């Protein structure tokens, strides 16, 4: 196998799709590349080093709306960005468990700094723009995770019966797209009121 | 050790606190109870059977505001309920990874049916009350998970520096409590407008 960073991430996403994250061992990655474990360890010191790099890499390969277009509102950027993120995260089995607990990589600094400067520049203070970006990030994570884990880890009172039917009727994209509009409108109400009691 | 359902869940939460979920093996549970694996298997057929039961059990032991008080608004019930849920989930290491992908247990049917009937009874249709309850559930899950995984998996442009400082300054309860008010206000705006374009 060729063994630079790029060929290791590829084999490691490929493997994450067959085994998920808890089956993603440096031993199955060595066996997948057809090499021996001291070879692998020359390159990949460990699983955290690896999970972190994969976190960076799924976004960089599949998360396109990371930057606001010229003339775009903060509400359209937060919508277009969340959807794009939900979808980078669903491209790979356990894509959202991989992201959990990370923090921006140095390779992403210019992108996420632009994002926080665009919010201040639209009237958010740093703390509130930060909180808006986090609630969007945390709601897309918990939504994709409840979807990915339910698919995989496979007498009703009348309403629960009907709700389960609705829940299951699609991938959870409708429930997501609708909670995203409520999140975005609640932030508008906050932004606009500020010192007026609301 | 005594080996009924109740003593198994106890030993299994105890063990989840030392090892987390990926260290929660039926072998370390057998060793923790001081018994042999065929003994254990008479009781606990497997890890899913076990994770599912723990999911039920943390809520039943630590999630108190599962039911609306008499005369409470749907906005105060959604607030009081989300906070209570965030906290059942944080009581145990990897408490929120345990919950992921589950669905209500038969032992919870009366509680979650009441919850969906209270929303319809406050003007939500079943589909929208469902979506409101889910967005609250998915935002508390992704928030607790990003917190629990970051604590555990342990050149800045100016704004990111300051945001990281803010992010870390508390457990993430302030960011959570604030995204929860934006979620709840966006649903009010939806509820009230209905057929009026909004
Ligand atoms: C909201 N949207 C999905 C985000 C985004 O699209 C990012 C991106 N690279 O495109 C993030 O990395 C993004 O997805 C993301 O994960 C972000 C973060 O994790 C954090 C953390 O943990 C702490 C401080 C600041 C941030 C952040 C502002 O960079 C976050 C931006 C998140
Ligand atoms: C929003 N609040 C945190 C909830 C709640 O407090 C529950 C509870 N037992 O107290 C749930 O089980 C609750 O936490 C929860 O997990 C619920 C569900 O998972 C679902 C699922 O997956 C599908 C259909 C219906 C539901 C639900 C209506 O029962 C959910 C209610 C969630
Ligand atoms: Mg992140
Ligand atoms: Mg649930």
CA distances in angstroms from A81 to A37, A59, A147, B100, B125, listed in the order given: 39, 11, 19, 24, 29
Q: Please give the domain boundaries of chain A with CATH numbers for all domains.
A: 1-65 (1.10.10.60), 66-197 (1.10.357.10)
Q: Return the residue whose CA atom lies nearest to atom 2 of ligand 1.
A: A137
C-alpha to C-alpha distance for B190 and B118, rounded to whole angstroms: 17
The DSSP secondary-structure symbol of B69 reads P
What counts of helices (H) and strands (E) characterise chain A? 10, 0
Interchain CB contacts (distance < 8 Å): A and B = 192
Distance B58 CA to ligand 1 centre (A): 30
Q: Which residue of chain A comes nearest to B103, CA vs CA?
A: A150
- B156 close to A109: Cβ distance less than 8 angstroms: yes
- The token duo for A154 is 């496979």
**Token pair of B135, please?**
């967005």
| Residue B45: CB atoms within 10 Å | 11
CA B168 to chain centroid, in Å, comes to 22
Contact assessment for residue B13 and residue B60, using Cβ atoms and an 8 Å cutoff: no
Measure CA of the first residue to CA of the last residue in chain B; give whole Å. Answer: 61
How far is ligand 2, taken at its centre, from the CA of residue A172, in Å? 15
Alpha carbon distance B84, B59 (integer Å): 9
Q: How far apart are CA B151 and CA B171, in angstroms?
A: 9
The token duo for B172 is 């993430």
Task: Say how far apart CA A171 and CA A40 lie, in whole Å.
Answer: 37
Residues A116-125: b if buried by 16+ CB within 10 A, e if exposed: bbbbeebebe
Name the residue among B186, B67, B191, B184 with its Cα closest to residue B122. Answer: B191
Token look-up 């030993």 returns B11
Tell me the two tokens of residue A172: 């959870």
If one counts every other C-beta atom within 10 angstroms of the C-beta of residue A68, the result is 20
Pocket test for ligand 1, best of A112, A140, A180 (most atoms within 8 A of CB): A112
Of the candidates B101, B137, B96, B129, the residue with the CA atom closest to the CA atom of residue B113: B129
Whole-angstrom distance, CA of residue A87 vs CA of residue A135 = 17
- Residues in Cβ contact with A128 at an 8 Å cutoff, skipping those fewer than 6 apart: A119, A190, A191, B178
- Cβ-based burial of B6 (10 A; exposed 0-12, middle 13-18, buried ≥19): exposed
> How many Cβ atoms are within 10 Å of A81's Cβ, its own excluded?
21
Cβ atoms within 10 Å of A82's Cβ, excluding its own: 22
Say how far apart CA B143 and CA A138 lie, in whole Å.
5
Q: Where are the alpha helices (DSSP H) in A20-46?
A: 26-33, 37-43
Chain centre to alpha carbon of residue B191: 25
Which residue numbers come right before each break in chain B (C to N over 2.5 Å)? 154
> Helix, strand or coil for residue A93?
coil
DSSP state of B68: P
Q: Which residues of A183-198 are buried (b: 16+ CB within 10 A; e: fewer)?
A: bbbbbbebbeeeeeee
Residue of B nearest to A145 (CA): B100
CA distances, A189 to each of A104, B135, B182 (Å): 29, 18, 8
Please give the Cα distance from B107 to B86 (Å, whole number).
20
| Structure determination method | X-ray
Taking CB atoms and an 8 Å cutoff, what residues of chain A touch B159?
Answer: 113, 116-117, 120, 126
Under DSSP, the state recorded for B64 is -
b/e for A25-60, b at 16 or more Cβ within 10 A? ebeebbebbebeeeebeebbeeeeebbbbbbbbbbb
8 A C-beta contact, residue B136 and residue B78: yes
Neighbour-count burial of B174, counting CB atoms closer than 10 A to its CB (0-12 exposed, 13-18 middle, 19+ buried):
middle
The gap between the terminal CA atoms of chain A, to the nearest Å, is: 61
Total residues found in chain B within this entry: 198
Task: Specify whether the CB–CB gap between B142 and A143 falls below 8 A.
Answer: yes
User: Whole-angstrom Cα distance, residue A128 to residue A125?
Assistant: 5
CA angle at B162 for the pair B160 and B164, rounded to the nearest 5°: 65
What distances in angstroms separate CA B32 from CA A15, A83, A194, B3, B10, one per listed residue?
Answer: 33, 44, 54, 12, 11
**Separation of B128 CA from ligand 3 center, angstroms?**
28
DSSP state of B17: H
C-alpha closest to that of A180 among A87, A67, A55, A60:
A87
3-state helix vs strand vs coil in chain A, percent to 5 = 70, 0, 30
What is the rounded CA–CA span in Å between residue A66 and residue B63?
A: 37
Write the CB contacts of A186 (distance below 8 Å, at least 6 apart in sequence).
B181, B182, B183, B184, B185, B186, B189
CA atoms of A129 and B162, how far apart (whole Å)? 12
Distance of alpha carbon A185 from alpha carbon A157, whole angstroms: 33
Report d(CA B6, CA B14) in Å as an integer.
Answer: 12
| Chain-centre distance for alpha carbon A79 | 14
CA A80 to chain centre: 14
Cα separation, B37 vs B110, whole angstroms:
36
Best CA proximity match to A25, nearest among A2, A6, A47, A58: A47
């Amino acid at each position: 196998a060729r063994l630079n960073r790029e060929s290791v991430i590829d084999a490691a996403l490929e493997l994450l799709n067959e085994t998920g994250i808890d089956g993603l061992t440096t031993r199955k990655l060595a066996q997948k590349l057809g090499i021996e474990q001291p070879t692998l360890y020359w390159h990949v010191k460990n699983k955290r080093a690896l999970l972190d790099a994969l976190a960076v890499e799924i976004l960089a390969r599949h998360h396109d709306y990371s930057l606001p277009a010229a003339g775009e509102s903060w509400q359209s950027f937060l919508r277009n960005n969340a959807m794009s993120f939900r979808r980078a995260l669903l491209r790979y089995r356990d894509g959202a468990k991989v992201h959990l607990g990370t923090r921006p990589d140095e390779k992403q600094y210019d992108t996420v700094e632009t994002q926080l400067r665009f919010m201040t520049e639209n009237g958010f203070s740093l703390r509130d723009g930060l909180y808006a970006i986090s609630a969007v990030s945390h709601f897309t994570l918990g939504a994709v995770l409840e979807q990915q884990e339910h698919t995989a880890a496979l007498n009703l009172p009348p309403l629960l019966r009907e709700a389960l039917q609705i829940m299951d009727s699609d991938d959870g994209e409708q429930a997501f797209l609708h909670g995203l509009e409520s999140l975005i409108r609640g932030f508008e109400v906050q932004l606009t009121a500020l010192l007026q009691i609301v």
